[PDB]
Amino acid sequence: GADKYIDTITGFSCEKAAVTDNGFLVIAIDADSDSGYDMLASQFLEEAKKEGVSGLKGVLIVDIKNAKFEQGAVVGKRIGKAYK
């Protein structure tokens, strides 16, 4: 699963992250803008796969300042995205 990867990037290259039930890796950053982070999403997706995280549909970037992490889901505007 993704726990080891998440535990390596948390507080390193993002503030919080989680895999959601629908198969996305959601990464929360201290964003200055409310859109435009697709390139970051693609870099994270590539890195997650390089570190052996399987089964991801994609990476979603959200702003730590407004996202709400719940069990199995993250609520908030996606400020960047990348698909498998």
Give burial (CB, 10 Å; 0-12/13-18/19+) of 44: buried
> How many structural domains are present in the chain?
1
CA 50 to CA 35: how far, in whole Å? 26
What's the full length of the chain, in residues?
A: 84
Resolution in A: 1.4
Say if CB 43 and CB 58 are below 8 A apart.
Answer: no
Method: X-ray
How many Cα atoms sit within 13 Å of 35 on the Cβ side?
0
**CATH number for 6:** 3.30.300.300
CA 4 to CA 9: how far, in whole Å? 9
Which domain, by its residues, includes 6?
Answer: 1-84
